[PDB]
Design an enzyme around this catalytic site. Structure first.
Site, short mmCIF file in Angstrom:
data_model
loop_
_atom_site.label_atom_id
_atom_site.label_comp_id
_atom_site.label_asym_id
_atom_site.label_seq_id
_atom_site.Cartn_x
_atom_site.Cartn_y
_atom_site.Cartn_z
N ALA A 118 7.89 0.80 -0.52
CA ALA A 118 6.71 0.28 0.38
C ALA A 118 7.24 -1.01 1.04
O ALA A 118 6.49 -1.17 2.08
CB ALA A 118 5.52 0.36 -0.31
N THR B 87 6.21 -3.48 4.97
CA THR B 87 5.22 -4.51 4.82
C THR B 87 4.96 -5.72 6.15
O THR B 87 4.05 -5.80 6.56
CB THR B 87 5.24 -5.46 3.79
N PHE C 228 1.79 -0.93 -2.46
CA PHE C 228 1.04 -0.45 -3.52
C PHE C 228 0.86 -1.80 -4.57
O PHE C 228 -0.22 -1.67 -5.12
CB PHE C 228 1.39 0.60 -4.12
N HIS D 151 8.10 11.61 -1.77
CA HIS D 151 6.76 11.65 -1.84
C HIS D 151 6.06 12.14 -0.80
O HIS D 151 4.79 12.22 -0.77
CB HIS D 151 6.30 9.96 -2.24
N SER E 65 9.50 -1.28 -6.57
CA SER E 65 9.33 -2.00 -8.01
C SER E 65 9.93 -0.89 -8.85
O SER E 65 10.07 -1.36 -10.18
CB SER E 65 7.82 -2.54 -8.14
N1 LIG Z 1 9.18 -7.91 3.11
C1 LIG Z 1 9.48 -7.68 1.68
N2 LIG Z 1 10.87 -7.62 1.12
C2 LIG Z 1 10.99 -7.65 0.05
N3 LIG Z 1 10.20 -6.97 -0.97
C3 LIG Z 1 9.17 -6.72 -0.63
C4 LIG Z 1 8.52 -7.00 0.70
N4 LIG Z 1 7.27 -6.41 0.78
C5 LIG Z 1 7.23 -5.91 -0.32
N5 LIG Z 1 8.11 -6.04 -1.31
C6 LIG Z 1 8.17 -5.55 -2.34
O1 LIG Z 1 8.33 -4.31 -2.48
C7 LIG Z 1 7.94 -3.63 -3.73
C8 LIG Z 1 7.17 -2.20 -3.47
O2 LIG Z 1 6.79 -1.92 -4.69
P1 LIG Z 1 5.75 -0.82 -4.73
O3 LIG Z 1 4.48 -1.47 -3.92
O4 LIG Z 1 5.43 -0.31 -6.35
O5 LIG Z 1 6.10 0.40 -4.04
P2 LIG Z 1 6.99 1.59 -4.31
O6 LIG Z 1 7.60 2.33 -2.76
O7 LIG Z 1 8.14 1.16 -5.31
O8 LIG Z 1 6.07 2.79 -4.81
C9 LIG Z 1 6.45 3.74 -5.56
C10 LIG Z 1 5.53 4.89 -5.17
O9 LIG Z 1 4.06 4.12 -5.90
C11 LIG Z 1 2.84 4.55 -5.35
O10 LIG Z 1 1.82 5.08 -6.08
C12 LIG Z 1 3.27 5.45 -4.25
O11 LIG Z 1 3.19 6.88 -4.43
C13 LIG Z 1 4.79 5.18 -3.76
O12 LIG Z 1 5.37 6.07 -3.06
C14 LIG Z 1 7.26 -4.67 -4.30
O13 LIG Z 1 7.62 -5.14 -5.61
C15 LIG Z 1 7.05 -6.00 -3.58
O14 LIG Z 1 7.41 -7.13 -4.38
C1 LIG Z 2 3.85 9.25 -6.13
N1 LIG Z 2 4.26 10.50 -6.88
C2 LIG Z 2 3.92 11.74 -7.22
N2 LIG Z 2 4.38 12.42 -7.74
C3 LIG Z 2 5.49 11.95 -8.44
C4 LIG Z 2 6.45 12.19 -9.36
C5 LIG Z 2 5.81 12.40 -10.50
N3 LIG Z 2 6.17 11.44 -11.64
C6 LIG Z 2 6.31 13.78 -11.28
O1 LIG Z 2 7.45 14.23 -11.61
O2 LIG Z 2 5.14 14.86 -11.65
C7 LIG Z 2 5.47 10.40 -7.79
#
Ligand SMILES: Nc1ncnc2c1ncn2[C@@H]1O[C@H](COP(=O)(O)OP(=O)(O)OC[C@H]2O[C@H](O)[C@H](O)[C@@H]2O)[C@@H](O)[C@H]1O
Ligand SMILES: Cn1cnc(C[C@H](N)C(=O)O)c1
Ligand SMILES: [Zn+2]
EC number: 2.3.1.-
Length: 282
Positions: free
Chosen positions: A44, A48, A55, A124, A200
């Site tokens: 994500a 941004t 998230f 996803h 993350s």
């Molecule tokens: N401009 C930027 N530059 C660098 N890092 C950034 C920026 N903006 C945000 N961040 C970092 O970007 C990171 C985003 O981390 P997360 O928010 O956990 O998103 P995911 O894609 O890993 O989440 C996975 C799933 O969880 C959800 O439930 C959904 O199902 C998602 O699909 C953060 O650490 C920010 O510090």
């Molecule tokens: C955002 N998200 C939704 N489903 C997942 C996978 C989940 N950990 C599974 O394998 O059951 C991620």
């Protein structure tokens, strides 16, 4: 749902100083030059800068919920433009420096950027994509599919089927799409470089796929403002905005970041375009 573990939310941001940041992006350029098979992992944080909140960042969807506050959108999903990072990823695939792209993002921006769907795993789902339960035929719509959790959208299949169209948005309990996870896993295992951008890495198996590259001597680069689950396994961690990182990297590689023509869907990748000759490194 209510009980779903949303992981570590709102961890403090890290900013590498300007000197360290430039040294690390030059090291990332050195790694991309040396690597035969480069796989990108996006979450994500790469959206941004187009107004889509993440998230788990300071103003993330889950972080803000934890504080009884609301996430803020500066765009609709429909009016959101691919970032410099999205368009950099398009170019890197075009010139053959990106083998595969694994994304956790449901925002549809990779597809809409013109990134070829046969080198993309959307683990996803995609808010603009609905799928026929009967024939598995996917439709890439110009507007978000109105449902989440693999529910009936109310439209029917039009293949030469009338099957029930459903959204592609996984709910917490739903396992990843077998085709996307299988291809993402294969791509990550075979990679000699996995680069993570704004994830993350807290969601299994999505967040674990970069670690697979580390088997067989592969290198792992993590670009993120916050700490990530797998920071200790990184050969390189870059703490900076992904657009600053990717624009410096493209400059180092001698590549322009291409113009976005507006929303465009590309099913299949092409043979690589010409790219600059590689530096003498060692
Ligand atoms: N401009 C930027 N530059 C660098 N890092 C950034 C920026 N903006 C945000 N961040 C970092 O970007 C990171 C985003 O981390 P997360 O928010 O956990 O998103 P995911 O894609 O890993 O989440 C996975 C799933 O969880 C959800 O439930 C959904 O199902 C998602 O699909 C953060 O650490 C920010 O510090
Ligand atoms: C955002 N998200 C939704 N489903 C997942 C996978 C989940 N950990 C599974 O394998 O059951 C991620
Ligand atoms: Zn159908």
């Amino acid at each position: 749902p209510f009980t779903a573990d949303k992981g570590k939310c709102g961890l403090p941001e890290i900013f590498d100083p300007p000197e360290e940041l430039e040294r690390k992006v030059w090291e990332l350029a050195r790694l991309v030059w040396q690597s035969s098979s480069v796989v990108f992992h996006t979450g994500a944080g790469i959206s941004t800068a187009s107004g889509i909140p993440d998230f788990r960042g300071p103003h993330g969807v889950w972080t803000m919920e934890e504080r009884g506050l609301a996430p803020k959108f500066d765009t609709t999903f429909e009016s959101a433009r691919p970032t410099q990072t999205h368009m950099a990823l398009v170019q890197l695939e075009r010139v053959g420096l990106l083998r595969f792209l694994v994304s956790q993002n449901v925002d549809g921006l990779h597809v809409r950027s013109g990134f070829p769907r046969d080198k993309l795993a959307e683990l996803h789902g995609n808010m603009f994509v609905e799928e026929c339960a009967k024939c598995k035929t996917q439709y890439v719509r110009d507007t978000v599919v109105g449902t989440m959790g693999l529910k009936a959208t109310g439209r029917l299949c039009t293949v030469a089927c009338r099957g029930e169209l459903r959204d592609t948005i996984l709910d917490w309990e739903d396992s990843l799409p077998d085709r996307d996870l299988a291809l993402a896993d294969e791509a990550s295992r075979n990679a000699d470089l996995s680069i993570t951008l704004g994830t993350s890495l807290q969601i299994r198996p999505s967040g674990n796929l970069p670690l697979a590259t580390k088997r067989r001597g592969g290198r792992l680069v993590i670009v993120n403002l916050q700490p990530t689950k797998h920071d200790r396994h990184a050969d390189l961690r870059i703490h900076g905005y992904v657009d600053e990182v990717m624009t410096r990297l493209m400059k180092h590689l001698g590549l322009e970041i291409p113009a976005w023509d507006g929303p465009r869907v590309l099913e299949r990748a092409l043979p690589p375009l010409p790219r600059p000759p590689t530096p003498k490194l060692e």
